[PDB]
Design a protein around this ligand. Structure first.
Ligand code: MG
Length: 113
RNA sequence: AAGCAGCUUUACAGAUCAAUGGCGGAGGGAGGUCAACAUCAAGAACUGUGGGCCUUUGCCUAUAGAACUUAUAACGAACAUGGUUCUUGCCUUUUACCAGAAC
């Protein structure tokens, strides 16, 4: 097994460097989701109970999405829908109409966060 | 529109009393605080049918039919409630509330 690893060379990849630091939250950034279609913005749920939407190219802040009362743990953006799904430690799963930026279609049943 | 002729029918006397041609006829009418199924808010908006293009979709062209609803816009010349979210009001907590919005 060990002579077959030395027989093989890994693919070269280009290294990574920091290009932009964005300071906008009041707590920890706990989750990041990208726009799956057309790639203009990303959204960061956080520890200050609010999700912010950041433009990918310029780095400016587009909007803030409040509506959770505890820390937003994960954020998922849909490719087939204009829907944003967001869970938190406050036992809530929420949907968001991105054509309206309002909470629709709330989900219920998790015993904990 | 009286009257005459032409036309369409009509009670019919017919010609034919055949092959015909026209209209009607080859399982009703009125209803029911009966039922089922469709359908009832959108480029001012529908569908069937023929033709051509591309390769079925879509477009263009020709044609037929469009009930109900709608312009001081809506089936209802009528008018309640609930959910979420935002902003207020009441001010021990909650429910029940206050009264505007958006969905
Ligand atoms: Mg108590």
């Amino acid at each position: 097994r060990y002579e077959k690893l030395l027989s093989q060379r890994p693919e070269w990849h280009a290294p990574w460097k920091l290009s932009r630091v964005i300071n906008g939250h009041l707590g920890w950034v706990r989750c990041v989701a990208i726009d799956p279609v057309d790639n203009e913005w990303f959204i960061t749920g956080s520890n200050d109970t609010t999700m912010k939407v950041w433009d990918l190219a310029t780095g400016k802040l587009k909007t803030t999405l409040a509506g959770h009362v505890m820390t937003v743990r994960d954020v998922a953006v849909s490719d087939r829908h204009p829907y944003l799904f967001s869970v938190s430690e406050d036992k809530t799963v929420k949907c968001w109409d991105l054509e309206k930026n309002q909470i629709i279609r709330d989900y219920y049943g998790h015993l904990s966060g």
